[PDB]
Subunit: 359 residues, 4 copies
């Protein structure tokens, strides 16, 4: 269990960017720029720096060429320069490996701290960043599938309560979670910026990065991403969706980049900024908790996720989840889910909803 | 093969309404009025007459209480009173049983002809109908999920080419179809009114009624239907979707009424009214043909459909399809689909797409 | 009155394309292709052939460079090759000038008949056309403002009843109109393809072309055209809208091309294909008849319209409307409009709505 | 100037509700419930309490029957119970009239402070509120025009700089404003919750309440409100729009309730939560600043606004703006605007646009 430091937590504003390692920079560029329409802030033979339509900081995504595709850093902006020092003192008191660079780890970020956090995740904290042209009224550039904001990260970790307590001490507040009647926690969402989440924990073998999520303005923007992927004859890279989430109430889609990094496209969750924001707990067997329309969750969504790196750029070793598996207890041969609690009609036993079993 | 009559075909305008027999009238009313928001033109203890938002004829759907749920009639409006005479002559020459009622079979329809057509389907032809208030600008009534039009029927019949030729002689033109490279036709869509279809043929055991389709204005209206079904905790009645079709290019959803009658909600197909409108043929193994995004087609979609009645009100005997089954050749044990023709990557062998197998 | 021929009317399917004369081919290209996202079927130094996202015929719009900006032809497609024969006999019986070309007037159209119709408009009738790739599922090309179909034309003509009867004899059915309680007709809409219109008559000095209309799938696609025009700092080419029409019930926008040819963007009208489709009549003083939300109609919308050419490429002389003017009776100095019939509250006297 | 108190500012979360006095409660209920679809949290013969689709606090709007239509209180939720004490000490130091009710002024609110603020506006600060069913997934109730969140207030005040500095001291940050080259400020928008605003200042005679704004999910929801008003033959109560704002980038509509209280419907502004969020200044003569599509702003939008009440429930006397008028410099007889700066083509002189 992770103790609460005596040192004050840094004041975290929001998720700000991820740095993903990618194996073929040109094919990743085709996906993020040509298919998804993200905006280039800088690029060279080694890296592509990308931002969403409404962003003013330098980037939301950095694609770094390297030998092994993986999450290199998930970065949170903090409220003041001094909060970077606070983060350093906090993680040092946790006994975590830290690395400070006064001039940043990536272009367009200044003074920055990277840490191997207690769950094995590479986090960055920074304040200083190079401001760029905010493209939010550049409707001459606007795509039918325009990605407007970075919304959140989602992390796979074997012990959700242990992770949750740690993120609570860091100032994140839980908005929604998924549990069962026998006291197991399968997932939790938690926030700083007043949306449903900034980062989220998914119970599973880890550390691994489940996804990075971008917003659109409207639902039709997400439908267009699907339609465009069908036109490009890359519908096999649509993993799951589109749907309505139970948890978050957002309209969603999950797609896969060329190195199998999962991207969620997301819109229209709700305000969580009040400090007594009501938490919402879903039962793991509730077949409307993940897709509100009861569509089945593809098993890859539960099993696959990206490697993460340590601060030397080596892959973090995986620790196996010992708590019950969400896949197994819902859609596996011994699983079940319901539409109405207590009702056998519209319940599924040993298979997924809507007439499928696991492939 | 069904011979082309010497008598001229009636001039058919469009699909106009269906009469469905339902077992529990109040339950069916709850589905079509309270859930789906159709507008009541008349009701009593035995029948409910319903219309869409933009209709000016009396009704698009009649629900009739009876002991065995079934399609009782699928009704087409014809251009002139004299076309009802033409229909009668045409079907008599085809050797079909016909019944003519000067004052209609249902309220709000006048002179009408019902026939047992050569595929065993109960068709009605009429011109005369009581006009009602067209609600197309009654935005004080407009629901977030509003059904604006009746769009089409879809019929299950064992021999698609045989039915297709008959419908072409009756003046329907095929807009799209699904075939393989071995001479088999699995489905065809055909129209009079200048949309992708007024009726359609789906290969399988029949006669059965696959579905009735209603349109919305926008994609978000279909999303709202799903969202409402979730809120009402009847997401188990969402069979398939929502999705983008390959065939038709429409956004779509399939739901199931209380007697398992299938209803499609549909929007934004394209204009077919030119007489040389290009006919689109999709290969049965193309995994974007039914769902453009590659989502799997649930097996119930292929296997389940509604009984149809003869003119005496008895269920028509089902004739088994002997041609290859779309289910079997795509998602069955010896099935195959592709995302990209000739590419093994994104292809599926003996299972469905997106990680699923047949339950 | 224009007499009804003995000769059978051609079977007309739909409005199919317009040929517009433009003065600067590059500026017009920039409008129609870069701003509006229409798709190029063919172009050379003299002409650009454009189509909408869902079209399979060769084009919906031909831009032709010339000295005087004008409508050169409004073309309708007919059901069969023999319908072009029918059209020719029909207009000859009306004593109209016709010209027939077995290989088309423009690329991608085969046997075609052009006429100076009894209202002074250049109609084309054709069947044969070169099929192209239908781009209806090319979502890799789809724009946030995508124009998906050609929907209709709208014509300015001084005597609407006279024009109406002629179009009815040709097989068009009136769907909606605007009249007053004094026997005047101000506008009418009429159709072949089963939407609210294929062509429409606006009462005014004419012959002039009021607009050409293109459809989008959704209302947000029209919003995006406005948003883009703001970003391009060309919001002054937004004439009117966006709005909901009373007449047609469609969501709409009117914008102006570089030669002031007016383009409507339109979506979500209703099905008119039944032969007893109920005709809807609006009173001219009903302030919800043109914009359902009661937004005022700018005077330029009533006064400005494009010249049309005769078959020699010369401008048609404009004949003055003597019937009452829609502008004058609604928003002129002695104009009137109401929100609720018989209610003084929400009525406007001698001025337009909303202040 | 309004001096900065030494006492700490209350930590304000967001705009939370407005209490509007209405003269005919049944007519007002018809507008807010039957036309606009707000959800009833409580009602009796004297008041109706209403909330938006995604709200969990007791209400976002209280309609109170009374003799004179006016804003009675604009209420902000604060972060903790002790922030109500800080608010009291803060306004007391400012020299303002205050009133504290430990059991609230309206149902469903607990310990609350109302103040006559330095600009003459009745502000309320509270933490405690009765939680209700959050209806955010009640799609069985969802209307085609659904109002999903209370978004902000907009105040008319004569001296925008004076009010801006006061609100900045209270922790609001300016996100956008409208100025001219001669140094006049005509309006400013400022936030606590990380949208473009929680309250906004419009230059004019005041104190008056310009509008209260509610959000929808999508732009079609706003279109529907207009369409419904047409069907109900009350299109005369659509004042301005629908449009795209320059300021805020939001899609918008303005409508008038039965007492002429102005309601904005609003969607899809942008994130402002970072402390160095770039502030955007528009020139008053830019015809895309208010409606991005260059549609003209009707004069009523500039000249009409709601009375506000003092703590005794009497109407606050109005102080006339002495700075230049946005109406006069853009659409009045000596006014002008441009589409492109420096370009006479697309410019308007002594008239509005279009
Ligand atoms: Ca084969
Ligand atoms: Cl999920
Ligand atoms: Cl399908
Ligand atoms: Cl109009
Ligand atoms: Cl504004
Ligand atoms: Fe997520
Ligand atoms: Fe269908
Ligand atoms: Fe038009
Ligand atoms: Fe506002």
């Amino acid at each position: 269990e992770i103790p609460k430091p005596v040192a004050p937590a840094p004041d975290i504003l929001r998720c700000a960017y991820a740095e993903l390692v990618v194996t073929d920079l040109a094919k990743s560029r085709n996906f993020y720029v040509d298919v998804l329409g993200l905006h280039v802030s800088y690029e060279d033979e080694n890296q592509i720096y990308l931002r969403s339509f409404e962003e003013f900081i330098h980037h939301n995504l950095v694609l770094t060429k390297g030998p092994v595709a993986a999450l290199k850093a998930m970065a949170f902006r903090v409220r003041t320069p001094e909060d970077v020092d606070k983060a350093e003192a906090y993680y040092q008191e946790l006994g975590c490996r830290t690395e400070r660079r006064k001039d940043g780890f990536v272009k367009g970020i200044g003074d920055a701290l990277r840490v191997e956090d207690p769950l094995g995740f590479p986090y960055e904290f920074f304040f200083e960043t190079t401001h760029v042209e905010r493209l939010h009224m550049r409707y001459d550039l606007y795509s039918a599938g325009e990605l407007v904001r970075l919304d959140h990260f989602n992390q796979v970790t074997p012990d959700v309560p242990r992770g949750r307590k740690y993120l609570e001490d860091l100032g994140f507040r839980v908005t929604e979670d998924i549990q069962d009647d026998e006291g197991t926690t399968y997932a939790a969402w938690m926030h700083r910026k007043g949306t449903v989440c900034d980062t989220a924990l998914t119970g599973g073998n880890g550390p691994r990065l489940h996804h990075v999520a971008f917003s659109t303005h409207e639902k039709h923007n997400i439908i267009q991403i699907c339609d465009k992927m069908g036109a490009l004859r890359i519908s096999d890279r649509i993993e799951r969706g589109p749907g309505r989430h139970g948890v978050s109430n957002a309209f969603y889609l999950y797609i896969l980049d060329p190195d199998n990094h999962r991207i969620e496209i997301y819109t229209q969750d709700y305000y969580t900024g009040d400090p007594d924001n009501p938490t919402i707990t879903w039962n793991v067997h509730d077949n409307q908790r993940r897709d509100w329309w009861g569509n089945p969750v593809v098993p890859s969504w539960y099993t696959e996720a990206s490697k993460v790196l340590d601060l030397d750029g080596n892959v973090q070793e995986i620790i196996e989840r010992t708590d019950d598996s969400e896949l197994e207890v819902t859609i596996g041969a011994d699983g079940f889910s319901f539409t109405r609690a207590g009702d056998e009609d519209g319940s599924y036993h040993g298979q997924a909803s809507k007439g499928f079993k696991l492939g």
